Amino acid sequence: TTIAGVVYKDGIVLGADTRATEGMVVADKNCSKIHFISPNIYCCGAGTAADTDMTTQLISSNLELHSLSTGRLPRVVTANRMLKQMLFRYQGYIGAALVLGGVDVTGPHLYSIYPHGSTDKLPYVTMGSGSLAAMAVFEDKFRPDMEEEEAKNLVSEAIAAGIFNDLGSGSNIDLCVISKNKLDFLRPYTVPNKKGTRLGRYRCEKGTTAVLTEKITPLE
Amino acid sequence: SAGFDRHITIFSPEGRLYQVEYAFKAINQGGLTSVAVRGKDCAVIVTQKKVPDKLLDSSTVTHLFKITENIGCVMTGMTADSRSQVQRARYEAANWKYKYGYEIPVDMLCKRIADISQVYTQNAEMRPLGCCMILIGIDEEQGPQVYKCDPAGYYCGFKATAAGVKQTESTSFLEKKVKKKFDWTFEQTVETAITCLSTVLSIDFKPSEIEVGVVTVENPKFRILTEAEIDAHLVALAE
Amino acid sequence: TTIMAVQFDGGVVLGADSRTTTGSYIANRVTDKLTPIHDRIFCCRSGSAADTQAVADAVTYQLGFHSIELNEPPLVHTAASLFKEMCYRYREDLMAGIIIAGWDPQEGGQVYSVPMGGMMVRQSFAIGGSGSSYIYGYVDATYREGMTKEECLQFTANALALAMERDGSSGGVIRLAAIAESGVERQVLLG
Amino acid sequence: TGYDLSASTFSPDGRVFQVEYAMKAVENSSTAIGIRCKDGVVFGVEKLVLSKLYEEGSNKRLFNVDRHVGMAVAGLLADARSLADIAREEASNFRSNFGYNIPLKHLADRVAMYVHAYTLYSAVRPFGCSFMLGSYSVNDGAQLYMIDPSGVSYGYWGCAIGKARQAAKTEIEKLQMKEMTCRDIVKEVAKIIYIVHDEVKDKAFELELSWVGELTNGRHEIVPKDIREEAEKYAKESLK
Amino acid sequence: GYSFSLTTFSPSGKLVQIEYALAAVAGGAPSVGIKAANGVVLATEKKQKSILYDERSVHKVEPITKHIGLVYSGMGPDYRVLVHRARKLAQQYYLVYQEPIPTAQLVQRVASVMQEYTQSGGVRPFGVSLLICGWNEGRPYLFQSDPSGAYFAWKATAMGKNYVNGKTFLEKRYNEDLELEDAIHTAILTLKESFEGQMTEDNIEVGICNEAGFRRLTPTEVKDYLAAIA
Amino acid sequence: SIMSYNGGAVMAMKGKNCVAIAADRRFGIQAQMVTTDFQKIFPMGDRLYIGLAGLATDVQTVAQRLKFRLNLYELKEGRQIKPYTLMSMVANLLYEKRFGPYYTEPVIAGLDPKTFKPFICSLDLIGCPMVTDDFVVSGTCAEQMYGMCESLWEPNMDPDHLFETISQAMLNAVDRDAVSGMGVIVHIIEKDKITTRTLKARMD
Numbered sequence A: 001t002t003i004a005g006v007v008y009k010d011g012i013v014l015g016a017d018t019r020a021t022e023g024m025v026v027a028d029k030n031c032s033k034i035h036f037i038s039p040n041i042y043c044c045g046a047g048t049a050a051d052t053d054m055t056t057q058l059i060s061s062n063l064e065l066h067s068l069s070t071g072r073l074p075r076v077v078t079a080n081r082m083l084k085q086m087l088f089r090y091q092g093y094i095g096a097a098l099v100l101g102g103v104d105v106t107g108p109h110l111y112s113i114y115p116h117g118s119t120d121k122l123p124y125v126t127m128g129s130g131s132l133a134a135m136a137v138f139e140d141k142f143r144p145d146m147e148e149e150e151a152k153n154l155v156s157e158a159i160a161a162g163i164f165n166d167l168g169s170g171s172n173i174d175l176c177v178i179s180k181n182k183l184d185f186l187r188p189y190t191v192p193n194k195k196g197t198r199l200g201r202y203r204c205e206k207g208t209t210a211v212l213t214e215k216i217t218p219l220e
Numbered sequence B: 001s002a003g004f005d006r007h008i009t010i011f012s013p014e015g016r017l018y019q020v021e022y023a024f025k026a027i028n029q030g031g032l033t034s035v036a037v038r039g040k041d042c043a044v045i046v047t048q049k050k051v052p053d054k055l056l057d058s059s060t061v062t063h064l065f066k067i068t069e070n071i072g073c074v075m076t077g078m079t080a081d082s083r084s085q086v087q088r089a090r091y092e093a094a095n096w097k098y099k100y101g102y103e104i105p106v107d108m109l110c111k112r113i114a115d116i117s118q119v120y121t122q123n124a125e126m127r128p129l130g131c132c133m134i135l136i137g138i139d140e141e142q143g144p145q146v147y148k149c150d151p152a153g154y155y156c157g158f159k160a161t162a163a164g165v166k167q168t169e170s171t172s173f174l175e176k177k178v179k180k181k182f183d184w185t186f187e188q189t190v191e192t193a194i195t196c197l198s199t200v201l202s203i204d205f206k207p208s209e210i211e212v213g214v215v216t217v218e219n220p221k222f223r224i225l226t227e228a229e230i231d232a233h234l235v236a237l238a239e
Numbered sequence C: 001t002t003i004m005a006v007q008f009d010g011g012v013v014l015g016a017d018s019r020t021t022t023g024s025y026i027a028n029r030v031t032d033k034l035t036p037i038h039d040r041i042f043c044c045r046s047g048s049a050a051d052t053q054a055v056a057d058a059v060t061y062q063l064g065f066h067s068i069e070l071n072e073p074p075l076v077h078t079a080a081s082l083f084k085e086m087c088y089r090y091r092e093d094l095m096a097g098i099i100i101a102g103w104d105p106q107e108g109g110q111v112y113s114v115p116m117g118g119m120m121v122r123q124s125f126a127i128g129g130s131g132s133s134y135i136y137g138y139v140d141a142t143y144r145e146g147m148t149k150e151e152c153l154q155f156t157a158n159a160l161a162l163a164m165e166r167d168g169s170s171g172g173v174i175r176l177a178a179i180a181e182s183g184v185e186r187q188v189l190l191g
Numbered sequence D: 001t002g003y004d005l006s007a008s009t010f011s012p013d014g015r016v017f018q019v020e021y022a023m024k025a026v027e028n029s030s031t032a033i034g035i036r037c038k039d040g041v042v043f044g045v046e047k048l049v050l051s052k053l054y055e056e057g058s059n060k061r062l063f064n065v066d067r068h069v070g071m072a073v074a075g076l077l078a079d080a081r082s083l084a085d086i087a088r089e090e091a092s093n094f095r096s097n098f099g100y101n102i103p104l105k106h107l108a109d110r111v112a113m114y115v116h117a118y119t120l121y122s123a124v125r126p127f128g129c130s131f132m133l134g135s136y137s138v139n140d141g142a143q144l145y146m147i148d149p150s151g152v153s154y155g156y157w158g159c160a161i162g163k164a165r166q167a168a169k170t171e172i173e174k175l176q177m178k179e180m181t182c183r184d185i186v187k188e189v190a191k192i193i194y195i196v197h198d199e200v201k202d203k204a205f206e207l208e209l210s211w212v213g214e215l216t217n218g219r220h221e222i223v224p225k226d227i228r229e230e231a232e233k234y235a236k237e238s239l240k
Numbered sequence E: 001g002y003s004f005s006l007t008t009f010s011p012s013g014k015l016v017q018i019e020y021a022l023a024a025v026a027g028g029a030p031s032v033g034i035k036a037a038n039g040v041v042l043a044t045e046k047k048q049k050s051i052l053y054d055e056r057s058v059h060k061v062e063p064i065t066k067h068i069g070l071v072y073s074g075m076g077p078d079y080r081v082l083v084h085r086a087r088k089l090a091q092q093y094y095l096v097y098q099e100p101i102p103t104a105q106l107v108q109r110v111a112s113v114m115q116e117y118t119q120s121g122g123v124r125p126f127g128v129s130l131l132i133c134g135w136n137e138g139r140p141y142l143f144q145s146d147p148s149g150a151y152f153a154w155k156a157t158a159m160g161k162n163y164v165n166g167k168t169f170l171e172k173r174y175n176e177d178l179e180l181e182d183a184i185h186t187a188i189l190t191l192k193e194s195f196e197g198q199m200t201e202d203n204i205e206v207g208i209c210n211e212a213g214f215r216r217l218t219p220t221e222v223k224d225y226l227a228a229i230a
Numbered sequence F: 001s002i003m004s005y006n007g008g009a010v011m012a013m014k015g016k017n018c019v020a021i022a023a024d025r026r027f028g029i030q031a032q033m034v035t036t037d038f039q040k041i042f043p044m045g046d047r048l049y050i051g052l053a054g055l056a057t058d059v060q061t062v063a064q065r066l067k068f069r070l071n072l073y074e075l076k077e078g079r080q081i082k083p084y085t086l087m088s089m090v091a092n093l094l095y096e097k098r099f100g101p102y103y104t105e106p107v108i109a110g111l112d113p114k115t116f117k118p119f120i121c122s123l124d125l126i127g128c129p130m131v132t133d134d135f136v137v138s139g140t141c142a143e144q145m146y147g148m149c150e151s152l153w154e155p156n157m158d159p160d161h162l163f164e165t166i167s168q169a170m171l172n173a174v175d176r177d178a179v180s181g182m183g184v185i186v187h188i189i190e191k192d193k194i195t196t197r198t199l200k201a202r203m204d
Helices: A049-070 A076-089 A131-141 A148-163 B018-022 B079-100 B106-122 B167-177 B188-197 B227-234 C049-070 C076-089 C138-142 C149-166 D017-026 D077-098 D104-119 D165-172 D182-195 D230-239 E016-026 E076-097 E103-116 E163-173 E180-191 E219-226 F056-076 F083-096 F142-152 F159-176
Strands: A002-007 A012-016 A020-022 A025-028 A034-036 A041-047 A096-103 A108-113 A119-121 A124-128 A173-178 A186-190 A211-213 A216-218 B033-038 B042-048 B064-066 B071-075 B133-139 B143-149 B155-157 B160-164 B210-216 B219-224 C002-007 C012-016 C020-022 C025-028 C034-036 C041-044 C099-104 C108-113 C125-129 C174-179 C184-189 D032-037 D040-048 D129-137 D141-147 D158-161 D205-208 D210-213 D220-222 E031-035 E040-045 E062-065 E068-073 E129-135 E140-145 E151-153 E156-159 E204-210 E213-216 F009-014 F019-024 F033-035 F041-043 F048-051 F107-111 F118-122 F135-139 F184-189 F193-199
Touching (some): A002 A096, A002 A108, A002 A131, A002 A148, A012 A041, A012 A148, A025 F142, A049 A076, A049 A096, A076 A108, A076 C049, A096 A124, A108 A124, A131 A148, A148 A173, B033 B143, B033 B167, B042 B143, B071 B079, B071 B210, B071 B219, B079 D104, B106 B143, B106 E076, B167 B188, B188 B210, C002 C041, C002 C099, C012 C034, C012 C099, C041 C174, C049 C076, C076 C108, C099 C174, C108 C125, D032 D129, D032 D141, D040 D129, D040 D182, D129 D158, D141 D158, D158 D165, D165 D182, D182 D230, E031 E129, E031 E163, E031 E180, E040 E140, E040 E180, E062 E076, E062 E213, E068 E213, E076 F083, E103 E129, E103 E140, E129 E204, E129 E213, E140 E156, E156 E163, E163 E180, E180 E204, E180 E219, F009 F107, F009 F159, F019 F048, F019 F118, F019 F159, F056 F083, F083 F107, F083 F118, F107 F135, F135 F142, F159 F193
Antiparallel strands (some): A002 A124, A012 A173, A020 A025, A096 A108, A173 A186, A211 F193, B033 B042, B033 B160, B042 B210, B071 B133, B133 B143, B210 B219, C012 C174, C034 C041, C041 C099, C099 C108, C174 C184, D040 D210, E031 E040, E031 E156, E062 E068, E129 E140, E140 E151, F019 F184, F041 F048, F048 F107, F184 F193
8 A cells, every 4th residue: 555645836646556455465456545525636545445435435525515505616624624623533443544635726735644633734745554665756856846747757656666565556556636727537557567478278168067956047 | 464463483374474574673673774885895884873871881882793803793683682693603603714724704604694593483482583694704706795694594695785774765875876887996985885874864973973894805804993084084075 | 852932021932843753753854843823822732643733723713712702812821721621631531742832912921831741830931842851951051031032042942953963753943933022933943 | 462471472563572571670679879980890789678677788789709790789689699690600610711810891791691591482581680790900990881681781880770770870970980089989879879769768778888999909898888987977968 | 273283183174384385485486497308497586676686696596416406486594404404415325325316316305304394383394395306317307395295297387476377388388308408498488478677697597407417507608598589 | 263253255256248156055163064055145136146254143134134225225216226336335334333343244246237237346344345357255265266266267258168167266265175165056147047056066
């Protein structure tokens, strides 16, 4: 699990990977870790997978309730204040590590949320197990107010540093580019890990398995 | 009449209900009249005071009520119901800032106030608060706004506003006034906010019988005018 | 984490490092450890991060609502009373190292200390945090009654730099604030 | 009339008579006045002896809410006692939650909202009391307040509650109260009580004077009028 | 003697107070809903008292979800209650089933809300009838509730003042299929049938349901339809 | 563990226009078997099944609570349930017992009610859904089932070779497990009909 974010001169680029493990066995080769919140705000999840899913849908339900009652575009500080006040009430029992990003009227805003309820506003963050490898690329190669393709190249480099560290992914690096007007969302942005071909004959026969009892039931 | 005696809040066969529309004439026992005007980037509240006694003070009479740093209001109707109405307004403005992390719009605050008044109509067993509230505030990418909240639970936003005893006379002036194309350059606003009231009541004060709240997109703080600068504008429209 | 507060004749002077760590890894390299509450009252927080962020938002909600009722600027002692009520009640649940300082119209500059227990006391100067034990004997050999503002900005800058040099949980960059009757002068320093 | 049983209903012209009815029950109570000088507030109550078996200081209408705040009630006495316990209890929570003495401008707001709540529901009735609030501070000076049964509360320089509400403040306003010391006020309160209705339709009365200001160092207590007896020595000189 | 309470019957017929609440719906602003072949058109009537009132403050055509809109004829302040109720109730479906709620399913539930205020005995019923529209699974839908709690499905209908003229109009004026544009031209023509004054871009307010979602029209869009409207 | 108290194995696999699902038959306490006819696959409407594995208490309990919520759903709506809608329904039921959780791990397989499109997914014990395109597995002998399915699965398979693939996957993986066995039942469903076969397995 490796998620990261950055603030360039116009908006926010988010990045993630595509592996869910159980124990030390790869359970999923393609898991979507960037979650929808609003048409300007997205969120990356880390930690307990079911705790991040149920939390990121509740707040996305309330902001849709709030903005439709207000009649205007939501604010990122509203989503920050709902999350940090929810997670503090559960005393860290809900294990959710979140990266919150979006573009408001005031501009782009990037946050990082810890499962006890401590939040930080930063120009760039990394969360997850492979966060230490991805912070190496940021702290070496960040400069303020980068351009579009310069920022997308940086995040795709920083996520790839965590993938070639352990507990990386069956790599499909994801990107979500949020700007003032344009919104992008790229699931197969880079596929570096290809499964090799199968070179064996595995001839199966229609009748190589013994059957004790058959049963047919038609339908309509 | 058909005559249901209108003792509680239920319907009449005509289709209406009388207890809520008895609260609209509950404002009139204040013996008072208030005017709000929105012309340009500034918005002006103006309201007279009535000090009947010399033993009675002056500072503790004012109906201008500061809700937040950037939102003020004025209250009409009876006094005791008006101040409790303000306490819910001050309270729920602070829950917005706590829950949502930014300053409440002036439009959203009247929705919260009118919904509290709606429950007292829908559900019985509480008297429905015979007072009216007029707000002002600055909203970014929207300009300044003026809103009125009714005891029935009705609200709307509009440019020139009257309340109190003399609505129909003062609003008849402002239709005749706001039909041309003015630019309302903050002394155009204050002068008409006087002279809308300065066709109506035939009074002549020396400048200590009104109150004027103001807000402006150069200093969006709510601001109650000084007796000296009230006297300035009272001879500035006025040659 | 090291926090600092010194009063003088006009007002008070605050100061802190940043370096929010987690175990032996720095999570946040630069951090606003000092927090506004009202226009003249700050606090600098220590202990658990998620606890002290939750307390300071509640006190700002209560004190900010309280002054609009009175139509008066709040007292610094009123703000320090609200932290005491939450920390003493919800002790055995929080780890908070709050120091409240700020200028007041009735009383001038004041500095209050609310440690992890829940007590409250006024001091001429107050420090706190994990790396507070190291400069703890420097500060009372160097303190002198009747300083100016510019001496106190020099006093806390040398005081924080010794712990930031030394304590592993401390360091980063120095954030300072001067609160007086006029305004709030915030600055970021390194040296 | 025929619309005036509950306090939750309106009249066909737009008012509530149950609030109107309870105000003129205070009107039948004896007169209690209040006045503030430039460094304090002086209270004064005309209180009449029931028959003879009153024991000289029973059931007084000068209460003591806080260290520096007291009341000057008039109306239903038992209803004012329960209302005074609200004000005693309200100042203790402000002390416990904020650590300093209650401001009088805020104390009158908390009480008047509590009086307001009995004017809404059909299950309860409005209070039949009205009263005064005086205090003194070095950061705020002296203040004097006034609360009706409806809940309307704001400040005066002098006031009167009772039968002779108009007949007392007719001659309060002929005093230059902005520059008098409160020790001079005490002998001036004495004549205003003694002018109106000593024993005309009644038999006898007794004077009570409460006292807060700079001379008491912010404390609120009864006057020492057992000391020097100067009220009755000076009020009874107005016989001519 | 039966017309003062709600929890008891009349010796012959039905509840009196619910019938009096329906009289309040008839004294409301007129409103028209027309179900076309590919969409649904809602239209209402929005006249302010004076020139002073801003028209861009309060709206009538109001979205519930991205494909579900809703109007009324009755009392405006009671309308805002069950809108906010229907908003929050639409999300509770979506938190469970992760799928936008079909338009048949809200009107099951919104009528059960308006049901509950017809109970005993110290509450009043609503004085609002509704018109609910949406395009779920290709076919559009146009429903109508009432303060009693019933709910139906119209080809086209009208409520408010002078509705019986608009009923007789649309009885003559409906066919099985027109396009969404011709439904708009005939929905303004029936609102013009009972009107007092010059119908401008601010006197009316129109929202539609495509299969591509719900949207309400801007005043420029509503001007250009009303420009050269028959 | 508590998951290893009774054993079990549930496998689903996606074909061309069809989908197959299989499970074992053994019921038993930790080392002692009891019976060989324990149902672990439950029909939820037509062309849509579900499989449960884990603690045999929560296998029977969740399958009755889910049937409770399904019949109320299919009466307020005249339509049948979509496969995505069931997955959101189950994940709601598991997450309500967030801190008292049921010890089971469901597997859902079925076709689209309107089109022919197959669908497979599986969930955790607290309700994290996971859709795939090839296969999902659950039970105690999980790692044995991954080793067979990674080698034998082909993208577009007729119902003949889909049956032979999931048969060879289940027979070889379960015989390597100790607490699973005693017979294997296979449901292979499609647009026209539903075929249920039971295989000749080692009864040791």
